[PDB]
Write a protein that binds this ligand. Structure first.
Ligand SMILES: NC(=O)C1=CN([C@@H]2O[C@H](COP(=O)(O)OP(=O)(O)OC[C@H]3O[C@@H](n4cnc5c(N)ncnc54)[C@H](O)[C@@H]3O)[C@@H](O)[C@H]2O)C=CC1
Ligand SMILES: Cc1cc2nc3c(=O)[nH]c(=O)nc-3n(C[C@H](O)[C@H](O)[C@H](O)COP(=O)(O)O)c2cc1C
Ligand code: SF4
Ligand code: SF4
Ligand code: SF4
Ligand code: FES
Ligand code: FES
Ligand SMILES: [K+]
Lengths: 213, 44, 263, 430
């Protein structure tokens, strides 16, 4: 929760960090997306790559991003503390993110938050002692019509009930993988009582195209 | 056979952690040569 | 010439294209209040104290950053200009600590002076304030970051003039903290000049700390001899004892800086 | 035309919105996309700008700036710097989840929109700044862009027109402020997502210093359909200066929260009672509606009866159209708790740069946290109003405006509820 750094024995510039050679090829592909002389524009992807290899960001991933992109290390520290995805502490293997903004709070996201809390035995901001689940509380995740919803590491779980989220936590503990979708009857975002629109077939190429084209 | 009942977007069940970056690495060859500012960085 | 005509409170002034609103008002002798604008740093536009009404325009503009367009009448003393100044001074004094007696900037503070001049005289803030963790950036600059008004003259100085690139803002929002993010010792050859351009007592002089107070110091304008640059300085004394050394502005030598040896 | 709504499926731009057809290239070409794209490229920049100015398309990001006038700011010869389209795909607005649906379900439509838009502005490439939380949507879009490169539709010799155009996708990293166009430019440039001041507009100094147009996913993706169907087709729907179709996100206290494409000037009551299945508990159970996502002030049930869901009829309802994200709040809602959660969102998503937002949004959240409990006195209401008026128009970007506006809407429509909250606090605590 802090935005200063103190050197612990598990988080210091002598903590080992190095990319894999496939990650170096991915970094080179990232750097080739930006103009020559603006390599600093690859700070946000590569550092996110340093979170995908490691799960979090010690202060050796930030310095390695600062080293391979030829940017000052404070300019990577700023990015790593500005953005909310960069875990500057070691989070669990399944990082549960419950959206509790107003369109999800109107559809009772607190029930699912308390369901995860009493299911896992932790509260908001903590990690289960088997290092498998970190529960924090996030802002609007862009799934507002599928409210309420959570996010687990990449995957949205939508239209949730407390029974559905207990089922998802049970199959995360079981070593399987859950299905990232709305757990109600609908598929993505449609009205649940049938399609109120887009029921006709799509008209195909050349429909309504103006003349002189 | 016209179908308006099945959700055809089942591919994102099969995405891993490096899927976006491997798609970027595959797309690295289809792209135009980047413009240059004339210097290696704004600190050069 | 390609000089364009603008107006400050009706009075005409001829300016080069690229002149800001603040410089255009400077050319007729009015100093628009500011905290983050410095004429030797880059334009940040992030304290919003220079918000000023251009007439026939229903929005205040950042005078440090907005260039003048031809025919503008800058209303530096109008009603919404003063309301904007009082609102911005109110937000600056929302979370600012009641440290003025125990602060080395008291009596030489920009925030005190243009709070007396351009702000309100009382508080509507009925909440608790923030408290920011202090930093250790060396044996020269005493750091009390609760007083920081987040104007980023730290960062613009250490980047552009000092060439260090090691001060910056971590966090986001009200939790945004200016610092090095690590236990780092900001010791450049020009590291004491951030004591100058910090408008508040967030960055003070650790040798000068607590010993004097600006109104009782006599100002003797003198010359540096610590090298052959010949930096113009102010030896400020008090009762026959040298209290500190400030810079004088000289455009051809030291523009308004001095080294740490001098200071 | 006088009445609006009831848009047909033959007039939809976003066919396959719901994911029911194939999102890939053989599915997109079979629904009308990538048809006669070479002719649209070869008829020139000024023809495409005239088609967008004819269509009356306004900025779908939420402000509604005229898209033809906006894109014509780039219609000028080069000065050595490249030119860029940048497609804003963050969509962090609470209530708004439509650009996720466009990226996830009609991705090639967004790619063809990038091609048409960047051709109209003479741009070199496209940077689709997608939100980082939309990771599966981003990989979805990258599979589509790989299909577009392997079919020769973009890249070197895009659609066989001799025009070169790349499409880049940059993920975000979890900051709502990075949806604002200059803060998005700063986030692309590898810096903190802090908004620049305007001037310079991005058409003069944008990404990397280049001329740049930042435009929303919806205002970019409808541009091939405008270039194919015509400008008069898109101007045939909605009122004057309110032309076209619009994706709507009706969420909150409705029976069926959904995204639906609909004609522009549709009534709010007709939209909710037709596509969303009505308010939970009936229409008399309606308390308030936030019409366009959290940046717009709420409107009560007496305004929601006859209001039209376009720009000007919501300006006349002293709110904004915004992203056309309808958040429905029933009579059982603690409405001050919802607006205070919203102001809490605005202080957690605020980049801390200039003084009024950095200080006043946290100070408004503290006042709203006391207003939920009632731990205040009524003279602090007008005080809070003035605090909003010290943020509105005194900030760098409009997140300060978008945080002052919900407070103003809540005070303006529910001052008696605030006052009875505080006086019952006063009677049961003093
Ligand atoms: N879609 C979303 O997720 C969100 C949308 N919004 C909406 O965004 C709006 C506020 O955003 P802003 O872009 O700051 O407001 P708006 O005033 O600035 O600007 C919209 C567009 O018009 C252009 N523009 C306007 N005047 C111009 C001029 N004279 N010269 C050149 N370009 C000009 C700007 O470049 C910009 O791209 C609100 O309506 C709000 O509802 C707010 C938050 C989230
Ligand atoms: C705080 C803030 C956040 C914004 N977030 C987004 C966003 O997430 N997506 C978007 O398309 N526009 C967003 N906008 C609007 C943009 O400034 C800009 O108007 C838009 O992205 C592109 O312009 P357009 O409306 O012509 O499409 C935001 C504006 C502000 C002030
Ligand atoms: S910095 Fe200025 S306003 Fe703040 S405590 Fe010191 S003298 Fe007072
Ligand atoms: S410490 Fe002083 S100079 Fe640095 S950002 Fe804060 S107020 Fe500005
Ligand atoms: S008003 Fe808020 S969101 Fe905008 S530049 Fe300032 S701190 Fe950032
Ligand atoms: S409000 Fe929870 S996803 Fe937008
Ligand atoms: S002086 Fe112009 S905003 Fe700080
Ligand atoms: K100082």
């Amino acid at each position: 929760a802090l935005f200063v750094h103190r050197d612990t024995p598990k988080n210091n510039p002598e903590t080992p960090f190095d990319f894999t050679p496939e990650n170096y090829k991915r970094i080179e592909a990232i750097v080739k997306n930006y103009p020559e002389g603006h390599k600093a524009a690859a700070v946000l992807p590569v550092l996110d790559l340093a979170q995908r290899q490691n799960g979090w960001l010690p202060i050796s991933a930030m310095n390695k991003v600062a080293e391979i992109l030829q940017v000052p290390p404070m300019r990577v520290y700023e990015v790593a503390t500005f953005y909310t995805m960069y875990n500057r502490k070691p989070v669990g293997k399944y990082h549960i993110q419950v959206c509790t903004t107003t369109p999800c709070m109107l559809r009772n996201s607190d029930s699912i938050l308390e369901a995860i809390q009493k299911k896992l035995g932790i509260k908001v901001g903590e990690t289960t002692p088997d290092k498998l689940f970190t529960l924090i509380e996030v802002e609007c995740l862009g799934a507002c019509v599928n409210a309420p919803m959570v996010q687990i590491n990449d995957n949205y779980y939508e239209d949730l009930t407390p029974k559905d989220i207990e089922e998802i936590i049970d199959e995360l503990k079981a070593g399987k993988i859950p299905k990232p979708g709305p757990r109600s009857g609908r598929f993505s975002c449609e009205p649940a009582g049938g399609l109120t629109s887009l029921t006709e077939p799509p008209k195909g190429p050349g429909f309504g195209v103006q003349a002189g084209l | 056979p016209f179908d308006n009942t099945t959700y055809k977007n089942l591919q994102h069940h099969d995405y891993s952690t490096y899927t976006f970056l491997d798609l970027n690495l595959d797309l690295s060859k289809f792209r135009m040569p980047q413009p240059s500012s004339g210097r290696e960085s704004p600190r050069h | 010439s390609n000089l364009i005509e603008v107006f400050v409170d009706g009075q005409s002034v001829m300016v080069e294209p690229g002149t800001t609103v603040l410089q255009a008002c400077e050319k007729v002798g009015m100093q628009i209040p500011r905290f983050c604008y410095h004429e030797r740093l880059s334009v940040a536009g992030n304290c919003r104290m220079c918000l000023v009404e251009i007439e026939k325009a229903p929005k205040v503009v950042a005078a440090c950053a907005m260039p003048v367009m031809k025919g503008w009448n800058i209303l530096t003393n109008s009603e919404k200009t003063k309301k904007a100044r009082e609102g911005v001074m109110e937000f600056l004094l929302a979370n600012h600590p009641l440290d003025c007696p125990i602060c080395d900037q008291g009596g030489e503070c920009d925030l005190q002076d243009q709070s007396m001049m351009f702000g309100s005289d009382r508080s509507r803030f009925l909440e608790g304030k923030r408290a920011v963790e202090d930093k250790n950036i060396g044996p020269l600059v005493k750091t009390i970051m609760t007083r920081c008004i987040q104007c980023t003259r730290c960062i613009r100085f250490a980047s552009e003039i000092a060439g260090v690139d090691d001060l910056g803002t971590t966090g986001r929002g009200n939790d945004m903290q200016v610092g090095t993010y690590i236990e780092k010792m900001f010791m450049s050859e020009l590291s004491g000049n951030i004591i100058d351009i910090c408008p508040v007592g967030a960055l003070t002089s650790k040798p000068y700390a607590f010993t004097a107070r600006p109104w009782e110091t006599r100002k003797t304008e003198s010359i540096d001899v610590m090298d052959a640059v010949g930096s113009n300085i102010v030896v400020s004394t008090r009762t026959g004892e040298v209290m500190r050394i400030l810079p004088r502005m000289h455009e051809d030598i030291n523009e308004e800086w001095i080294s740490d040896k001098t200071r | 035309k006088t009445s609006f709504g009831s848009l047909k499926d033959e007039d939809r731009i976003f066919t396959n919105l719901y994911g029911r057809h194939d999102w890939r290239l053989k599915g997109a070409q079979s629904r009308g996309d990538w048809y006669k794209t070479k002719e649209i490229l070869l008829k020139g920049p000024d023809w495409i700008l005239g088609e967008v100015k004819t269509s009356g398309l306004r900025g779908r990001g939420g402000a509604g700036f005229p898209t033809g006038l906006k894109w014509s700011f780039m219609n000028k010869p080069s000065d050595g710097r490249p030119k860029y389209l940048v497609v804003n795909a963050d969509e962090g607005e609470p209530g708004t989840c439509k650009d996720r649906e466009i990226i996830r379900h009609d991705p090639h439509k967004l790619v063809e929109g990038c091609l048409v838009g960047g051709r109209a502005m003479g741009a070199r490439a496209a940077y689709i700044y997608i939100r980082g939380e939309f990771y599966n949507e981003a990989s979805n879009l990258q599979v589509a862009i790989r299909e577009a490169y392997e079919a020769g539709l973009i890249g070197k010799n895009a659609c066989g027109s001799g025009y070169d155009f790349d499409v880049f996708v940059v993920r975000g990293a979890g900051a709502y402020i990075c949806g604002e166009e200059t803060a998005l430019i700063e986030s692309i440039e590898g810096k903190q997502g802090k908004p620049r001041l305007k001037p310079p507009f991005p058409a003069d100094v944008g990404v990397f210093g280049c001329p740049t147009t930042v435009a929303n996913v919806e205002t970019v993706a409808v541009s091939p359909t405008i270039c194919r169907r015509g400008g008069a087709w898109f101007a045939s729907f909605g009122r004057e200066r309110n032309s076209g179709t619009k994706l709507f996100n009706i969420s909150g206290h409705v029976n069926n929260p959904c995204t639906v494409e609909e004609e522009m000037s549709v009534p709010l009551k007709e939209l909710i009672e037709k596509h969303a299945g009505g308010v939970t508990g009936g229409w008399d159970n309606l308390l308030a509606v936030i019409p366009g996502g959290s940046s717009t002030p709420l409107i009560p049930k007496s305004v929601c009866e006859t209001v039209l869901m376009d720009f000007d009829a919501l300006i006349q309802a002293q709110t904004g159209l915004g992203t056309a994200a309808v958040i429905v709040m029933d009579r059982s809602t603690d409405i001050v708790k919802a607006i205070a959660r919203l102001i809490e969102f605005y202080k957690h998503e605020s980049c801390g740069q200039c003084t009024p937002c950095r200080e006043g949004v946290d100070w408004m959240n503290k006042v709203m946290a006391r207003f939920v409990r009632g731990d205040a006195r009524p003279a602090e209401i007008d005080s809070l109003w003035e605090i909003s008026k010290q943020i509105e128009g005194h900030t760098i970007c409009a997140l300060g405006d978008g945080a002052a506006w919900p407070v103003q809407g809540l005070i303006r429509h529910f001052r008696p509820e605030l006052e009875e909250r505080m006086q019952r606090f006063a009677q049961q605590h003093q």
